């Protein structure tokens, strides 16, 4: 009925080695710069932002971007297919490292944070290096990150003071990921997560002041009755903070700074470039789905 | 009363001269007052109503 | 086809026709998804009144209920609007008064009038009502006002 | 007489009929595949009538 | 030595221009030739010749 | 208040086969170029030699195999048509004001399609001149190599 | 058009104001400069055309 | 019948174009203003 | 121009340009004398009159 076919021409032919590496990833969700059909090689992949990576600048980019799927790799050119909202497609599981998708799951589209062999394909026929995102199921997609966010924090304490972190206790509970009854040993040698650990720890000290300062102001006859219950979950030491030791112009800038690290950290985990698989074959790797933005 | 522009479907006439030279830059820094662009989905004769 | 015709049950004057003329192509929220509609549903200031105190949360909290529609035509007896289906490609024109530059691949969200009510409120004294307009703003300022208002 | 005017606005605003290609008989499979290919080839040319035939399509989803 | 007109060009509001000048607040220039494009011979594309 | 004149440009373009640029190219228009993918015409080019009587080995005839390919160039011109302009193309009309409004739908579609067809004759002369400039090395290189 | 094909950005306008000055100093009073130039009558004719 | 302003350069007849008119109408920069 | 590089192609454009008149008023002056208008009427007197 409607046309969705983004023909990516190339100024030069592909190498015999470079052609066969793209023949494998023939079902693959790719971000893509604009929605029209005649584009160059510089518009596809995350190589516009990731070819020294940063996390949140890619994660916020994957919501605002136009995603598309490979369908054909000829020698002189490519051909893609644009992915609309609520549009049925047929994705192949090709992503290295392999994670074993399942039917009736909710696949989410994440930035890559593993090595430069699993993520990207280096092309030298044209001078560009296309970068594939990380398509992982949503429940595993956060357990793969909230454990490596743990690894990136404790590997900075043992750099400053090595007697506080046990290396043998660290890589026994972080490098193993258990989901769907299967264990995935991840690969870690992390300059990707140096934006979160400076946002999540800069939020770590504003919350014990921020929940006492917000309770001492909101005390009245018309208090909502559930907050009487969560008035006890706050610890003993948090309820001994003197709020007089900071000036009134300082207590404004420890909320407006605090509320921005509350929302912008909450927004990137409630991003919705996800897609609902309704059929999956474990040995053919071909999966049907429908895309659903936000 | 000032004379104002109107987009009514006039029977426009055809001139030997071309008008196209420097128009895109002349719209930016005003060579002439009281103009109106029309991009693709709105560059047509408007429907007649009275 | 989809459209909304809105009656002006009394009349309207020549000053407020020129006031509604400058506000063409602007998104307003209106009450019900009927083809026929009266003046009482189109105002965002049916809750944001002058003699009462406004409630900028509850005004904004009212805004995620309503259907949202774009004006096309201002007539002295009617206002013909076009609506917005919940999954629909459409066009929006940057009329809105604090000028913030957009671009392709941005992320908009509709906010209550939070910098100048007097700019958004134009009063229709021929019918005993005032129609109040929201402002569409990219979400980098959509959130940052709600961070500041709380 | 005015109902005959409405008989044209109905029959000009209907969606096009879905093609029925019989796969059981032989010479009725030839006459049905040909009217796909003789009718799609006039929904691609850049004239005005071929653009007139591309606007009648009604994409209802399943 | 050059050739040029001896007099000015005339424009008179006589005819059907005068009805719309009185009843409405406007008036054409050359209503008659303007009429022969719209209603007498429509959908004819403009051509310089 | 008057309306003293109403005017409009008419765009005429000299097409490709009428310019002087076709004196530097051969034009063989094909029916559907989508049929063949790649042209791979192969030429057997044979040089002549001078008969010498010198002490080296005698002159042998030479062939050179030259492999000429076909580069493909793809062009698209985009056209927007309004949704209220579409709707009154199908509608039934009998009054003389709905003939001069139906003339406004047929003078827009035929003008927004002679737009896109004009843009492809501009796309010939662009994509021949861009080919001639990607195979034109400058004077200071070529004067000495041409000698 | 060769100076403003790209549009009037900030770097084009300074490259035009540089040309307003150089054309004002050299080519002004052009019929007064035809006496002291040896070419002369051909300079005004390329100036005035 | 092709209209072109020819010139004789020593021994050869060579036509001279300038396609700047069709690039000044569409407001795209001419490819010979390198 | 339609060309198939990595550009995003332009849709069709259209410009509409409005022009207006400018009024101009000219004055003059005539001073006719008193007795000039006065003796423009009486006649059938002596041939000096």
Nearest to A132 by CA among A28, A285, A33: A28
Q: How far is CA G20 from the centre of its chain?
A: 7
Q: Does F97 touch chain E (CB under 8 A)?
A: no
Cβ contact I13–B43 (<8 Å): yes
Who's near A51: CB < 8 A, 6+ residues apart? A120, A128, A129, A131
Nearest to A47 by CA among A114, A111, A139: A111
Whole-number Cα distances in Å, A269 to A99, A159, A191, C147: 20, 28, 19, 19
Q: Could you tell me if C16 and C39 are in contact, meaning their C-beta atoms sit under 8 angstroms apart?
A: no
Distance CA I8, CA H26 (A): 15
Radius of gyration of chain E (CA): 15
Decide: H and B in contact? Rule: 3+ Cβ pairs under 8 Å: yes
Report the DSSP beta bridge partners of residue A82.
A68
Distance CA A121, CA A101 (A): 22
* Structural resolution in Å: 3.8
Strands (E), B1-50: 13-15, 35-37
Distance CA E44, CA F107 (A): 8
Q: Could you tell me if H16 and H7 are in contact, meaning their C-beta atoms sit under 8 angstroms apart?
A: yes
Whole-number Cα distances in Å, A55 to A176, A203, B28: 22, 17, 40
Report the DSSP beta bridge partners of residue A66.
A32
Query: What length does chain B have?
Result: 50
Cβ contact D8–F92 (<8 Å): yes
Beta-carbon contacts below 8 Å between D and F:
21
Q: Could you tell me if C79 and C66 are in contact, meaning their C-beta atoms sit under 8 angstroms apart?
A: no
How many Cα atoms within 13 Å fall on the side-chain side of residue A8?
Answer: 28
Report the DSSP beta bridge partners of residue A67.
A31
Distance CA A54, CA A132 (A): 15
Mutate to test the interface with A, among I3, I4, I5, I6 (most CBs of A within 10 A): I6
Using an 8 Å CB-CB cutoff, list chain E residues near B48.
none
In the structure encoding, which two tokens stand for residue A211, read together?
Answer: 């929940």
Distance CA C43, CA C130 (A): 7
Whole-number Cα distances in Å, D39 to A243, D13, D26, D34: 79, 19, 21, 8
Distance CA E42, CA F7 (A): 17
Q: Which of residues 31-50 of B touch H (CB under 8 A)?
A: none
Q: For G6, name the nearest residue in chain H, comparing CA atoms only.
A: H29
Mutate to test the interface with D, among F77, F92, F95 (most CBs of D within 10 A): F92
Who's near F99: CB < 8 A, 6+ residues apart? E42, F93
Tell me which DSSP letter residue A9 carries: B
Q: Does I7 touch chain F (CB under 8 A)?
A: no
How many Cα atoms within 13 Å fall on the side-chain side of residue I22?
Answer: 1
Nearest to A9 by CA among F127, E31, D23: F127
From the list F22, F23, F122, which residue is nearest H22 (CB)?
F122
Using an 8 Å CB-CB cutoff, list chain F residues near D9.
91-92
In the structure encoding, which two tokens stand for residue E6, read together?
Answer: 């001896």
Tell me which DSSP letter residue H9 carries: E
Which domain does C8 fall in, by range?
A: 1-138
Distance CA C121, CA C109 (A): 20
Q: Sign (positive/negative) of CA torsion E42, E46, E49, F5?
A: positive
Using an 8 Å CB-CB cutoff, list chain F residues near B49.
none
Who's near A45: CB < 8 A, 6+ residues apart? A30, A31, A120, A128, A129, A130, A131, A132
In the structure encoding, which two tokens stand for residue A41, read together?
Answer: 């090689």
Angle at A39 between CA A36 and CA A44, to 5 degrees: 100
In the structure encoding, which two tokens stand for residue A216, read together?
Answer: 């001492």
Which residues in chain E are followed by a discontinuity, with C-to-N distance exceeding 2.5 angstroms? none
Q: Does B5 touch chain I (CB under 8 A)?
A: yes
| Axis crossing angle, helix C56-63 with helix C139-149, rounded to the nearest 10 | 140
Tell me which DSSP letter residue A42 carries: G
Q: For A66, name the nearest residue in chain C, comparing CA atoms only.
A: C105
Cβ contact B11–E48 (<8 Å): no
Q: Could you tell me if A67 and A25 are in contact, meaning their C-beta atoms sit under 8 angstroms apart?
A: no
Could you report how far apart the first and last alpha carbons of chain C are, in Å? Answer: 42
Letter string b/e over residues A56-69, b meaning 16 or more CB atoms within 10 A of that residue's CB: bebbebbbebbbbb
Q: How far is A87 from chain D (nearest CA, A)?
A: 10
Q: How far is CA F98 from the centre of its chain?
A: 40
Asked if the peptide bond before residue A97 counts as cis, ω within 30 degrees of 0, the response is yes
Cβ contact F125–H22 (<8 Å): yes
Pair type for strands A7-8 and A38-39: parallel
Decide: H and A in contact? Rule: 3+ Cβ pairs under 8 Å: no
Q: How far is B26 from chain G (nearest CA, A)?
A: 10
Q: Does A1 touch chain D (CB under 8 A)?
A: yes
Distance CA A120, CA A132 (A): 6
Chains adjacent to C (≥3 CB pairs closer than 8 angstroms):
A
Who's near I11: CB < 8 A, 6+ residues apart? B39, B40, B41, F78, F79, F80
Ranges of H-type helices in F15-147: 83-90, 99-109, 113-133, 139-146
Using an 8 Å CB-CB cutoff, list chain I residues near B2.
20
Q: Which helix or strand (DSSP H or E) is residue A30 part of?
A: strand A29-32
Cβ contact I2–F112 (<8 Å): no
Letter string b/e over residues F51-75, b meaning 16 or more CB atoms within 10 A of that residue's CB: eeeeeeeeeeeeeeeeeeeeeebeb
Burial level of A79, CB count in 10 A (0-12/13-18/19+)?
middle
Q: Which residue has the tokens 């309503």?
A: C66
Who's near C81: CB < 8 A, 6+ residues apart? C3, C4, C5, C6, C28, C30, C69, C70, C71, C72
Nearest to A105 by CA among A135, A137, A134: A137
Distance CA E11, CA F41 (A): 71
DSSP codes, A45-56: SGGGT-----SH
3-state secondary structure of H6: strand
Angle at A39 between CA A36 and CA A43, to 5 degrees: 100
């Amino acid at each position: 009925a409607l046309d969705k076919s983004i023909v990516v021409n190339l100024t030069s032919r592909l190498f015999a080695d470079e052609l066969a590496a793209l023949q494998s990833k023939i079902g693959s969700v790719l971000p893509l710069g604009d929605c029209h059909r005649l584009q160059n090689i510089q518009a596809l992949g995350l190589g516009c932002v990731c070819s020294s990576p940063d996390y949140i600048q890619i994660m916020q980019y994957l919501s605002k971007c136009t995603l598309a799927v490979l369908e054909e790799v000829r020698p002189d050119s490519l051909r893609l297919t644009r992915m609309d909202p609520s549009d049925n497609l047929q994705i192949k599981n090709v992503y290295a490292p392999f994670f074993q998708w399942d039917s009736n799951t909710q696949l989410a589209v994440l930035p890559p944070l593993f090595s430069r062999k699993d993520s990207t394909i280096v092309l030298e026929s044209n001078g560009f290096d296309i970068v594939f995102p990380m398509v992982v199921p949503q429940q595993l997609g956060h357990a793969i990150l909230q454990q490596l966010l743990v690894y990136h924090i404790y590997s900075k304490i043992s750099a400053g003071a090595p007697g506080d972190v046990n290396m043998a206790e660290l890589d026994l509970y972080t490098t193993n990921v258990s989901f769907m009854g299967r264990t995935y040993r991840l690969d870690v040698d992390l300059r990707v997560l140096d934006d979160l650990s400076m946002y999540l720890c800069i939020l770590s000290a504003l919350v014990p002041r921020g929940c006492l300062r917000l309770l001492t102001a909101l005390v009245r006859h018309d208090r909502h009755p559930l907050t009487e219950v969560f008035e006890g979950v706050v610890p003993d030491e948090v309820t001994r903070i003197d709020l007089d030791q900071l000036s009134v112009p300082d207590d404004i800038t420890r909320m407006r700074v605090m509320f921005s690290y509350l929302q912008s950290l909450s927004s990137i985990f409630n991003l919705g470039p996800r897609l609902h698989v309704y059929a999956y074959s474990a040995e053919t790797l071909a999966a049907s789905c429908w895309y659903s933005p936000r | 009363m000032e004379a104002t522009l109107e987009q009514r479907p006039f029977p426009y006439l055809a001139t030997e001269a071309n008008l196209l030279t420097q128009i895109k830059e002349s719209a930016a820094d005003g060579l002439f007052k009281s103009f109106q662009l029309l991009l693709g989905k709105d560059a047509r004769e408007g429907s007649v109503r009275f | 086809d989809k459209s909304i015709v809105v009656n002006l049950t009394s009349r309207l004057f020549a000053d407020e026709l020129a006031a509604l003329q400058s506000k063409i192509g602007s998104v307003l929220p209106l009450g019900d998804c009927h083809r026929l509609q009266n003046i009482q549903a189109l105002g965002l200031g049916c809750v944001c009144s002058r003699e009462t105190s406004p409630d900028y949360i509850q005004i904004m909290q009212y805004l995620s209920k309503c259907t949202l529609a774009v004006l096309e035509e201002v007539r002295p007896d009617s206002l013909r609007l076009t609506r917005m289906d919940p999954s629909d490609n459409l066009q929006i024109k940057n009329v809105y008064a604090p000028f913030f530059q957009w671009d392709s691949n941005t992320q908009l969200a509709v906010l209550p009038p939070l910098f100048s009510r007097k700019d958004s409120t134009i009063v229709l004294e021929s019918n005993g009502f005032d129609i109040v307009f929201p402002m569409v703003v990219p979400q980098q300022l959509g959130h940052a006002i709600l961070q500041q208002l709380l | 007489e005015n109902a005959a005017r409405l008989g044209r606005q109905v029959l000009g605003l209907l969606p096009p009929p879905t093609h029925r290609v019989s796969l059981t008989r032989g010479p009725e499979f030839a006459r049905g595949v040909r009217d796909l290919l003789s009718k799609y080839a006039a929904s691609t040319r850049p004239t005005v009538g071929s653009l007139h035939e591309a606007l009648r399509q009604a994409p209802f989803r399943q | 030595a050059m050739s040029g007109p001896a007099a000015y060009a005339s424009y008179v509001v006589r005819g059907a221009n005068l009805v719309t000048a009185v009843s409405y607040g406007r008036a054409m220039r050359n209503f008659e030739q303007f009429m022969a494009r719209i209603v007498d011979h429509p959908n004819a594309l403009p051509s310089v010749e | 208040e008057a309306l003293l004149g109403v005017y409009t440009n008419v765009v005429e373009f000299v097409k490709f086969l009428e310019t002087a640029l076709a004196a530097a190219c051969v034009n063989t228009e094909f029916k559907d170029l989508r049929r063949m993918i790649d042209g791979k015409i192969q030429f057997k080019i044979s040089m002549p030699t001078i008969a010498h009587g010198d002490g080296r080995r005698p002159n042998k005839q030479r062939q050179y195999i030259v492999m000429k390919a076909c580069n493909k160039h793809h062009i698209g011109a985009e056209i927007e048509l309004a949704a209220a302009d579409i709707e009154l193309l199908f509608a039934e009309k009998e009054t003389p004001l709905d003939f001069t409004e139906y003339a406004g739908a047929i003078k827009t579609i035929t003008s927004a399609l002679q737009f896109g067809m004009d843009a492809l004759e501009r796309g010939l002369v662009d994509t021949v001149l861009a080919v001639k400039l990607r195979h034109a090395p400058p004077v200071f290189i070529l004067k000495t190599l041409g000698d | 058009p060769v100076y403003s094909e790209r549009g009037l950005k900030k770097a084009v306008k300074s490259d035009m104001v540089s040309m307003f000055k150089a054309h004002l100093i050299e080519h002004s009073f052009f019929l007064d400069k035809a006496e002291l130039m040896t070419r002369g009558k051909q300079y005004v004719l390329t100036m005035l055309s | 019948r092709i209209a072109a302003s020819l010139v004789k350069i020593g021994d050869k007849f060579v036509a001279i174009e300038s396609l700047q008119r069709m690039y000044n109408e569409t407001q795209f920069p001419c490819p010979l203003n390198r």
